[PDB]
Write a protein that binds this ligand. Sequence first.
Ligand SMILES: CC[C@H](C)[C@H](N)C(=O)NS(=O)(=O)NC[C@H]1O[C@@H](n2cnc3c(N)ncnc32)[C@H](O)[C@@H]1O
Ligand SMILES: [Zn+2]
Ligand SMILES: [Zn+2]
Length: 1032
Amino acid sequence: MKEVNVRESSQEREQRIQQQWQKGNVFQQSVQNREGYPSFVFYEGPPTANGLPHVGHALGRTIKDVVARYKTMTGHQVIRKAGWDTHGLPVELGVEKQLGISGKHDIEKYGVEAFINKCKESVFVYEKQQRTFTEQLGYWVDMEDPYITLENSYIESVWNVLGTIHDKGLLYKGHRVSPYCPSCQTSLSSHEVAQGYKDVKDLTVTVKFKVKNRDNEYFLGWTTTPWTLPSNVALAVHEEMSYVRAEQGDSVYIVAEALADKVLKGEYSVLSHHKGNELKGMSYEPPFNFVKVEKGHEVVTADYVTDQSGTGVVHLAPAYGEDDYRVVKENGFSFVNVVDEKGQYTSEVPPFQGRFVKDCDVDIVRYLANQDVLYHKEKHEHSYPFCWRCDSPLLYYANESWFIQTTALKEQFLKNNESVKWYPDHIKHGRFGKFLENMVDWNISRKRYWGTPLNVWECEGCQHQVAPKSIKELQKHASHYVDDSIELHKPYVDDVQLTCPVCSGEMKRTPEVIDVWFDSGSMPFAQYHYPFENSELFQKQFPADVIAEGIDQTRGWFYSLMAVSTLFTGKAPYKRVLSLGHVLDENGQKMSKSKGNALDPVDLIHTFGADALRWALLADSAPWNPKKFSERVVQEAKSKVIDTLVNVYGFYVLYAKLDGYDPEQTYELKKTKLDEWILSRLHSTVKRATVHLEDYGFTSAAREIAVFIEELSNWYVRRSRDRFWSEGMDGEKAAAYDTLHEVLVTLSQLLAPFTPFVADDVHENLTGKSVHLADYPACDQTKVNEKLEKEMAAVLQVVELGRSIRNTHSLKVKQPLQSLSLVVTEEDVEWKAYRDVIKDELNVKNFNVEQDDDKLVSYVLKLDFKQAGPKFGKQVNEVNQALKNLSEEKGKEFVEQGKLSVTLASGENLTLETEDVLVEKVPKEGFAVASNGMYTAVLDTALTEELVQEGVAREVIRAVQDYRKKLDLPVNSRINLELSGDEEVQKAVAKFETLLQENLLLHSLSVKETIKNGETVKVGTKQVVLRVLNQS
Ligand SMILES: CC[C@H](C)[C@H](N)C(=O)NS(=O)(=O)NC[C@H]1O[C@@H](n2cnc3c(N)ncnc32)[C@H](O)[C@@H]1O
Ligand SMILES: [Zn+2]
Ligand SMILES: [Zn+2]
């Protein structure tokens, strides 16, 4: 079974394991071997094929992989089909940059087909880069037969979904004020808008509107967007709000009563009161008269007008605000637009014609000053929407768009969300639920070229709508031949016309493509070409038991999945969501190619291994909140966890080969208490890690396993090395091999979801079988020993205290010390059974357990000046010296009694209060103390000549052993040793001759004054010459 561990880099090991997986079809087999087992349904969120993966993209892939691998080992069939997101602005803008073009006109000049072909080439390149990263990460997901949103079958399924929605009356065209990108030149959905808010500072202005058929009378109108003033059509007031005409100097101003003292400043006199109902119908003069409004420039009532802020009179521009649009339409007032598709001023506004409307703000203000209509200006700091792709400021623009009527099913939305288990829980009614509660209809139409065509044909004659669900329906309705090979993209589908079933007129397809989020949201149905194929497989693969993606999908794939599934089937498409916090750099800053702070995950995988990167991503911090990350954490994962497992595994393999241990052979076993302890810790770790994984606590399970690995290396193997080093297969050595074999097999199984490469290396070399075809190990409670674990933990605490004392007092563990005393308050731990271990680890001749420190401490008394200065006056220092002069028993007496007296030099006796004396408990001479509260270790640090000489003899023994290894001698060869050194070394060697002979297989030992051709070694601070003569 066991072959060998070799000097190989992490990359070489992982490449070898990957090749093993390829030759054996291990991923395929881990799916197929679970046929007939219960299903665990997993949906892969399709990464966008528009860029190179960064380290953040390794998080979800890792977590998904863990889940899938874990669910496979606990007896589920987990089908994993990969997907790529290939449409939309996320691809189009990058391709435009590659081509050095921008805007729809440039694309039309370039050619729609040529631009689309460029998009296809780009997405293919990025797909391959993503695929290589995914394979090197060890995330098993089928990328040889993935779903791709640009494939015809996927688009046909999307078309079927959209047509079914249209059948329900929930897909409609409407002229609405929608968020709009002036650069991308398209409307955007509400989730896209939610992804792009930034804090900005701009100007809100109060402007005078001359009342008509009056003189020196002006309405005070308010706006937060000065650039819409040329498009003014009306002024809005609340009908039940009280307004005032107030004289100020030569003029009269109309303003809300509650706001007049704020708007009017310096001097004013209120002449009359009017309700907003009365101000209705009064005409006025617009600040800009470039635009001609045939019906407008009046005052109207609107219930949303507030007296909390502004003036109570609100400028209304119907094309650039939803409320303005609704109110202007209700009163019959006319709709005017002064902005082109790029956000620039149209010809109807001459002075700024051809400039972005927002950038014209400042000039507008001065223009207002030159017409003498400005009244106030104020800075406004607020959240404003920016495009989630181009980063341009958005505009609210009247535009004809296609909507999915999500609001019609809002209740069902909420119901479906109520059935979903969210990790972390707060997303359910927080980030996600709050977005559901504020639902607006889904604007899906994009005036772009690369994407899923909106499959709605409209009759030029009577505007009847037909939405083909399939290529067959498209062919059926077409007025001309349509080949079976038709590609469902622009411009090919724009050359397909239909005959209107109503009037036989020409039906043309609406030109738009759909929002990319619809493509990804349709994957449960489109990944298997439902309902045209794989109906049984689709039924078995719906809904998902889990999905796991980043938190941004709360305004993304989580929403688009929920929306498409609710509109199409009414059902929730997933039962459970893992919403992952984004990975940041070590400073907490978001990683970007522009910033240059993005770590290359491929380089990290090459340097430290995918196992290390995954472990760092899982164990350094939880996946729910934003995660600081660094190369250092990957380094620490590799050195502390992965390397440790590899070293233990190689140790086992080497010595099992040398001693000819065969796990199939039945040996007589003499299991020690350390074997039992490590087995108990193993099965306890199995239990706790399983419990955490069942609740998707990856971090806690990883940390538990890491604790077990540290205990296995630093304590079990290190203290059991002699049993592997010894010669002859006694019961104790066989028990050691059996214990380590069980630990390695079960541990590699536990680690299989976390660190798949090294886990398979260990498991396959030890068992001949891949760990990823294995069952997750069960906890054997009969091997759990809670008492032994508790006692061993106490022993470890004592050992750490002893080491701390030795380090504080520069007493190297190679130097034996006389005693350790452990003061313990309770008989919790059977210390006797561990005496040897403790005496071994701290190198002490005696280990004594005491219930009190009476025999180990003394008391030293001093005076508290801050509490007793005035009482003793000039005698304070004399009293303090007398206190420092009392005997040990006097200090013990003060500690017991609390009352003390000091007899000063003059013979005067003085009484000391408890608060006057500062008490110090010191260790007895030669002793040093460390304490964790529960345990107090007192170490005898006093050195004798005998102790020092024993230390020198130990150093000589070690030097001789090292020299024997250096000269490559047989382990059974008895040697003639010649030793030269000063008299301290000679006396130490002579006194401990017996010990040297027990620890060295010496035929003769000669102490010589001078050694010819001898090796000079360092024994402590001394130099000693050694020489071997026979059997060298
Ligand atoms: C589910 C996929 C969506 C439909 C879409 N194609 C998309 O967002 N595609 S992506 O490639 O941009 N994102 C892939 C996954 O990585 C997450 N992610 C993106 N940026 C980070 C980051 N900085 N830190 C951690 N995770 C991050 C996404 O949420 C998605 O899960
Ligand atoms: Zn944009
Ligand atoms: Zn018609």
